[PDB]
Design a protein around this nucleic acid. Sequence first.
RNA 1: AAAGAGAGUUUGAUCCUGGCUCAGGACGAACGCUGGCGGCGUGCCUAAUACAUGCAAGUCGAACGAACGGAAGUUAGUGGCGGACGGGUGAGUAACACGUGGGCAACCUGCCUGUAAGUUGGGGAUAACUCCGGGAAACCGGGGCUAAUACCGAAUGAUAGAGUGUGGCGCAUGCCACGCUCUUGAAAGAUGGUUUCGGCUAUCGCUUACAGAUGGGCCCGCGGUGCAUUAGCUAGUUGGUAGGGUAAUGGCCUACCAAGGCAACGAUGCAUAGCCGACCUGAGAGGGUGAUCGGCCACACUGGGACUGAGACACGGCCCAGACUCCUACGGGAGGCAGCAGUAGGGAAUCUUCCGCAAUGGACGAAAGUCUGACGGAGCAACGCCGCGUGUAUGAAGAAGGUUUUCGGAUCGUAAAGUACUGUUGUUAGAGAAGAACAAGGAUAAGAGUAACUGCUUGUCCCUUGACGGUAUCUAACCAGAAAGCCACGGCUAACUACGUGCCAGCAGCCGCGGUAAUACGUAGGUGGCAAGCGUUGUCCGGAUUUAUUGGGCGUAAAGCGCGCGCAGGCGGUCUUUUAAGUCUGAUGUGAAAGCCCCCGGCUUAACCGGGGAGGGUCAUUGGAAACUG
Lengths: 88, 67, 199
Amino acid sequence: AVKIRLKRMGSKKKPFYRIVVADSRFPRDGRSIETIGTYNPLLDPVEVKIDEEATLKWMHNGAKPSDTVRNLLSREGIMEKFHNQKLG
Amino acid sequence: LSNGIEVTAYIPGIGHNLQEHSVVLIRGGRVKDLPGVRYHIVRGALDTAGVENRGQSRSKYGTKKPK
Amino acid sequence: ARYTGPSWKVSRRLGISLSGTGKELERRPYAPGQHGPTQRKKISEYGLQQAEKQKLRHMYGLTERQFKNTFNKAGKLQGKHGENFMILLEQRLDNIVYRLGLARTRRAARQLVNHGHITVDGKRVDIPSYQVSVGQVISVREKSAKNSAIAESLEVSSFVPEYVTFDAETLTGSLNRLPERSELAAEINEAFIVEFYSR
RNA sequence: AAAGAGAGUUUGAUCCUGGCUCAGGACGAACGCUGGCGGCGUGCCUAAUACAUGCAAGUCGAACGAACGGAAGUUAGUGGCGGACGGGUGAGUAACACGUGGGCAACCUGCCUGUAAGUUGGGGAUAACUCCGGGAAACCGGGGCUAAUACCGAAUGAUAGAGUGUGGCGCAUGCCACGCUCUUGAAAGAUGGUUUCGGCUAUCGCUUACAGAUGGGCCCGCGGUGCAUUAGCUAGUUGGUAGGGUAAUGGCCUACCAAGGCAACGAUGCAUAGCCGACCUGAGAGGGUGAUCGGCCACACUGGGACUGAGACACGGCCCAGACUCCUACGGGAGGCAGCAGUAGGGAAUCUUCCGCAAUGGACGAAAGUCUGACGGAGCAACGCCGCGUGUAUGAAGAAGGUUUUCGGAUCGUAAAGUACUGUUGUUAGAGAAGAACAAGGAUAAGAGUAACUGCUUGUCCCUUGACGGUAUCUAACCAGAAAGCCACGGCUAACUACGUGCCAGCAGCCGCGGUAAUACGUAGGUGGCAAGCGUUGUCCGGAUUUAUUGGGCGUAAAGCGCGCGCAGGCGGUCUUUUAAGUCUGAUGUGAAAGCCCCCGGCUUAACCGGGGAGGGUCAUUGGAAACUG
Ligand SMILES: [Mg+2]
Ligand SMILES: [Mg+2]
Ligand SMILES: [Mg+2]
Ligand SMILES: [Mg+2]
Ligand SMILES: [Mg+2]
Ligand SMILES: [Mg+2]
Ligand SMILES: [Mg+2]
Ligand SMILES: [Mg+2]
Ligand SMILES: [Mg+2]
Ligand SMILES: [Mg+2]
Ligand SMILES: [Mg+2]
Ligand SMILES: [Mg+2]
Ligand SMILES: [Mg+2]
Ligand SMILES: [Mg+2]
Ligand SMILES: [Mg+2]
Ligand SMILES: [Mg+2]
Ligand SMILES: [Mg+2]
Ligand SMILES: [Mg+2]
Ligand SMILES: [Mg+2]
Ligand SMILES: [Mg+2]
Ligand SMILES: [Mg+2]
Ligand SMILES: [Mg+2]
Ligand SMILES: [Mg+2]
Ligand SMILES: [Mg+2]
Ligand SMILES: [Mg+2]
Ligand SMILES: [Mg+2]
Ligand SMILES: [Mg+2]
Ligand SMILES: [Mg+2]
Ligand SMILES: [Mg+2]
Ligand SMILES: [Mg+2]
Ligand SMILES: [Mg+2]
Ligand SMILES: [Mg+2]
Ligand SMILES: [Mg+2]
Ligand SMILES: [Mg+2]
Ligand SMILES: [Mg+2]
Ligand SMILES: [Mg+2]
Ligand SMILES: [Mg+2]
Ligand SMILES: [Mg+2]
Ligand SMILES: [Mg+2]
Ligand SMILES: [Mg+2]
Ligand SMILES: [Mg+2]
Ligand SMILES: [Mg+2]
Ligand SMILES: [Mg+2]
Ligand SMILES: [Mg+2]
Ligand SMILES: [Mg+2]
Ligand SMILES: [Mg+2]
Ligand SMILES: [Mg+2]
Ligand SMILES: [Mg+2]
Ligand SMILES: [Mg+2]
Ligand SMILES: [Mg+2]
Ligand SMILES: [Mg+2]
Ligand SMILES: [Mg+2]
Ligand SMILES: [Mg+2]
Ligand SMILES: [Mg+2]
Ligand SMILES: [Mg+2]
Ligand SMILES: [Mg+2]
Ligand SMILES: [Mg+2]
Ligand SMILES: [Mg+2]
Ligand SMILES: [Mg+2]
Ligand SMILES: [Mg+2]
Ligand SMILES: [Mg+2]
Ligand SMILES: [Mg+2]
Ligand SMILES: [Mg+2]
Ligand SMILES: [Mg+2]
Ligand SMILES: [Mg+2]
Ligand SMILES: [Mg+2]
Ligand SMILES: [Mg+2]
Ligand SMILES: [Mg+2]
Ligand SMILES: [Mg+2]
Ligand SMILES: [Mg+2]
Ligand SMILES: [Mg+2]
Ligand SMILES: [Mg+2]
Ligand SMILES: [Mg+2]
Ligand SMILES: [Mg+2]
Ligand SMILES: [Mg+2]
Ligand SMILES: [Mg+2]
C-alpha cells in the first residue's frame, strides 16, 4: 500500500534522507510517487522541512506514515491538523 | 596463439633464452624492415627473461633494478 | 614540500629571480649542467610557452595536476583568464602566510602551514591549498607563538603588499581586498599560458 | 554570451592535388619497472560453461485438535496471509520491446482511506492421533474417533439479468440520473468492560455496494541498425454475416460469403543488437558507446502445459519429455548458484566461505517479537579521482668524489658538511562523539462514541538501545631520523658530452641511423617531462574540409553516362480574392530522480554530499498573424 518512507541518500557514514510517497513494494531508493521533504539526522536539532499541504492530502486519501517518517517527525503539528480536519 | 592463429613475432633486446615449445606473451606493433613480422614478444612476461645487465630504458626488456 | 631539490638551479634555468631577489643569479646566471656557459639557440613557440608555464608553476612550487586544476577553476570566473588564474593562485593560504611575513620563502610557509601552526577564523588548517577569502583572520593560536623561526622572519620584512593588513603585535593577518594584475610579479607573460593550454 | 593552432615525407629544386605518420582527451583495462599515507568511488568485458559446501522466505497460541510445569508459558498438524516483493543476468527480441504524446462510450485492481447497510440460524466430514497391511531403508495404502475464522445448504438483502416508464445528453457503436414488476445473489468469529440475572457492548476481523488512491491490461501517431552480389511476400491470409471465448475490443477461435492485403517512401529474406535517462570526444553540427546509478522489457539447465491466487503460466512451486550428476537391496528415488561467499575451467585479465539487524525499507502479528547474503559496515587489489608527505632557514670564488678538460679550469653545487628550527607523518601514553527517534510500557489533559466504563484518536512528560568500535577526532612527549621512481635528450618535441662498437651487435611512430671521430646502437656523467607513480599495447573521438548540411569537387591530377524519347520524382514567369498544410507567435500540460551548467551551503580544503534554478521536444490541446512556399 501507499506509505511515506525516507529514501536514504548521501555518503558513507553520512546519511541524508528524503521524505517520499511510495508504493511499499518498490525498492527503497527506487521509483517514488512524489517527494515532500528532507531529513538530516546529524544536526543538533534535526533540520526537517516538510510541505504541509501535500502531506495532509496524501494522509487524507490513503497514505499513512512509517514510524520515524512523519509519525514521529510530525512535531510540526501536521498530525494535529489532520486530527482537526478529520473531526471537522 | 591461444585462439588458433599462427603469427610471426619479433624478439627485442640483446640476447634471449627461449627455445622451441615455450610459452610467451605477445603485443602489437611491427618491424618496418622485416617483411612478415608484425608483433613483438613481451620480455620478462611468462618464460622470457629480462635482458642481461641492462642499465637504462629498463622498464622495457623487463630487467629488475640492481639492488 | 613537494619537490625538495636545490632551489638555485631551477631559477638559473628559467632566467628570473624567483624565490626573492637576485641572490640566485649573483654569480653565473647561466643554465646548469656541463653546458650552459656555451650558448642558447632559437627557442620555438613551444619553448616560449612552456617557459612561461614553468615560470608560474615553479614560483609557487605546486605540482602540475594541481596547476591545471586551478587553471580550469579560474576559467569559470568573469573577465580574463590569466588574470583570474594568477588571482586564484594568490588566494592560496600558503602564499598569504608568506605575504604577511610570517615566513621567509614559499618552501618554509608550506611547512609552517602543514604542521598546524596557522589557524583561520580561530580553527587550525593543515592544507596549504586552502583558498583564503576576504575578511577571514589569520593567526598562530599560540601553537608556536614565540618560536625562533617566526620571530626571525618578522625582522626581515621589506613591505607587505597593500592588499594584506598584518598586525605584528598580535600576529594577526587578514586579506583587505582582492589583488589586481598590476600588483603581482609581472616578470612573466600571463597571455602565453592560455595559448599553451589551448593546444 | 560561445567561437576552430599544426608538423614530417614524392623533387636537383618549384607550386598544386594526394595518401601515410605524429603531437591532445578517455578507459570496468592488461603487461613492465617501482610503491608512503588518508578520503570518495570501482572490480568475470571471455564459457547464458559445470557446481563441493554454508546461508539467501517465512510468520501467526488472541482461528482450531497434544507433552513439560502445578495455576502462566513453549513446538509437530489443520487453517490465514506472504512466497508474483526484495536480489541476478542481457541469452532471446528489428517488434508497440523502448522513448515521447494521446485514447479506453472496450477494462481489472488483494492490502490502504472514507461512507451506507449486516455479521440470523442449521448440517455432514476430514487432517493430527490410534491399530493393521508394505518395504532394514528413505519411501505408501486400509479400519476407528475428533475442532474451527476449514467446508456445504437455508432465512433476509443487489444500482447484477429480464420487461419497462420518464427525463438530460455524446463522437457513429452509444452515456448519466430517477421510478415500476419479477428473477436470482452472502457472512465468522476471537481477545476484553459491563449490567442484573436476559443483552449491550470496545477495538480487529468477516459479507455486500459506492467513491478515492496505488498497481496493471489493450489500442494508436511519430522516432532511433547494415545488405537490392536479398524482389516479390501472404491462404485465417484481407474484409463481411452469426456464434464461442475474455476483465476487456479484436480472425483471438469457429461455421458460412467474397477475393482481398502488403511492397522501390524498401515488402520479404539474411546478419547484428536488449531500449532509454545518459557516458567519452568535438568550436559546433556531428561521431562512438548502452560498465556501475535510476526507469521499462525478457529470461531462470533446454522445450511444452496448466493448477492455486487479486495478481504467475511462477529463480530457491507442480506435471511430462531430453542431456548430465548423485543414492539403490534393481521394484525405484533426488537435483538445478544468470541470489551472497566460494571451487574447477576459459582467459591478457578481475575480490572474503566475514560482522549485524543498531539505521532505512520489507513479510507476518493486536503487540512484545521472529525472518530479511535487501541493506548498514568491515577485509583484498595504485583500478581510478582528489588531498600531503620523504623536511626548513642561513651556509664558500665553491671541501672530499664522480664526469670532462684546449690541462688554467668547467660541472654536479648551497647541493654537502656546519649552525639554528618544526612534527603533517611515524612511536608511545592518555582521553573519546554524532549516526538514536523511536516501537513497546507507565502517567496525566482534551475530543468522537456510549446508559456507563474498558478501549480509540490527539497533545504533554518519564522510560532503554550501536555491528561499525576504542573506529573519527583530540592532548602530551620523542627522532630529520624509517618514506623516490619511470621515460626521453637528431627533427616533429622541452633537454648534450665522454668511452665501447664497427652495415656487426642493435634502435625504430614517420623521415631513417650503424661501413674506427655515431649528440639516433650499449654504458656512464647531467639535462628535460611527470611524480606514488611512469611507460608500452588494445579500443574510441579529434587533428581528417580524408564523405564537405555548417564545409569539397569533375579541361590536363580520381571523377560528365557514346547519344536521344520519355513514366514516377525534384523545381518552376506576372497580378488579384481566398484558405491556413508548411511558416512565425501567446497560453495551458508534460519532457521523473541522479548526471552536464548557474547561484548558495555543509565536510579543516578538494574530490564527495545538500538546497534552489535553468537547459533539453521538427511533443500534445487551444488562440492569434498572412510576407513567402502549398
Ligand atoms: Mg642516466
Ligand atoms: Mg613523382
Ligand atoms: Mg592516442
Ligand atoms: Mg607496497
Ligand atoms: Mg617493496
Ligand atoms: Mg556476464
Ligand atoms: Mg504469545
Ligand atoms: Mg507450530
Ligand atoms: Mg522475483
Ligand atoms: Mg525484479
Ligand atoms: Mg541494485
Ligand atoms: Mg543493461
Ligand atoms: Mg474498507
Ligand atoms: Mg450440529
Ligand atoms: Mg487414515
Ligand atoms: Mg464431528
Ligand atoms: Mg444460497
Ligand atoms: Mg440492473
Ligand atoms: Mg430518455
Ligand atoms: Mg464484572
Ligand atoms: Mg461490576
Ligand atoms: Mg464479433
Ligand atoms: Mg523486415
Ligand atoms: Mg547471434
Ligand atoms: Mg545478444
Ligand atoms: Mg566511460
Ligand atoms: Mg565515466
Ligand atoms: Mg569537447
Ligand atoms: Mg571538426
Ligand atoms: Mg561495455
Ligand atoms: Mg555486469
Ligand atoms: Mg551488481
Ligand atoms: Mg549454468
Ligand atoms: Mg484463478
Ligand atoms: Mg518463486
Ligand atoms: Mg537457485
Ligand atoms: Mg555468483
Ligand atoms: Mg575453500
Ligand atoms: Mg578459480
Ligand atoms: Mg587460463
Ligand atoms: Mg532491520
Ligand atoms: Mg524485545
Ligand atoms: Mg533462515
Ligand atoms: Mg552492501
Ligand atoms: Mg601495475
Ligand atoms: Mg581491478
Ligand atoms: Mg633548504
Ligand atoms: Mg674555485
Ligand atoms: Mg675529484
Ligand atoms: Mg600525530
Ligand atoms: Mg530520544
Ligand atoms: Mg506509545
Ligand atoms: Mg479503567
Ligand atoms: Mg629532533
Ligand atoms: Mg629542442
Ligand atoms: Mg632507445
Ligand atoms: Mg627518437
Ligand atoms: Mg632528474
Ligand atoms: Mg626534471
Ligand atoms: Mg597524487
Ligand atoms: Mg570504445
Ligand atoms: Mg570529419
Ligand atoms: Mg577533393
Ligand atoms: Mg583523368
Ligand atoms: Mg559527352
Ligand atoms: Mg561516368
Ligand atoms: Mg544522355
Ligand atoms: Mg513531371
Ligand atoms: Mg516547456
Ligand atoms: Mg532531470
Ligand atoms: Mg565550502
Ligand atoms: Mg550533486
Ligand atoms: Mg542539484
Ligand atoms: Mg522555462
Ligand atoms: Mg496573401
Ligand atoms: Mg497564396
